[PDB]
């Protein structure tokens, strides 16, 4: 309902924002729940 009401620049800003937020979440989840323990990953820098 809300994203449909945005103009194009607000939408571009929104999408940029969300991707940054999603990365932090996906990365953290991945590191703790998915990443193989063989890889000593404790951070986003190590995931990189």
């Amino acid at each position: 309902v809300l994203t449909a009401g945005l103009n194009s620049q607000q939408a571009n800003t929104l999408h940029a924002f969300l991707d940054e937020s999603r990365s932090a979440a996906l990365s953290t989840y991945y590191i703790r729940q998915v990443a193989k323990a063989a890889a000593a990953i404790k951070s986003r820098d190590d995931l990189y």
Partner: protein
């Protein structure tokens, strides 16, 4: 996992409200509507608080369920490792300050 009950739909809602009204002025000007919601939830307009987090924040911690909650909030890790300041720092991606 680093406290990450990430809710994308929540963030879409939160960001749009900030994009449409960057200071919530319309709400300041329209108390009939703002007053329909409890302040604890209005907090999430600005604060990054997903409904799962909201329920965690309002969760009662007592002696009887302390072990249970550990398992349900941190997961089955080890309370002794969470206790280590380095572990803690990495777990929540914290600064030293």
């Amino acid at each position: 996992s680093g406290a990450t009950p990430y809710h994308d739909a929540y963030e879409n809602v939160r960001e749009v409200i900030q994009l449409q009204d960057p200071g919530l002025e319309q709400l300041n000007a329209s108390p009939a509507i703002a007053g329909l919601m409890h302040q604890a939830s209005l907090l999430g307009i600005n604060a990054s608080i997903s409904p799962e987090l909201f329920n965690i924040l309002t969760e009662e911690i007592t002696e009887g369920n302390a072990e249970e909650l550990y398992k349900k909030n941190f997961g089955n890790i080890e309370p002794a490792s969470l206790a280590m300041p380095e572990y803690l720092k990495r777990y929540y991606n914290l600064s030293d300050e």
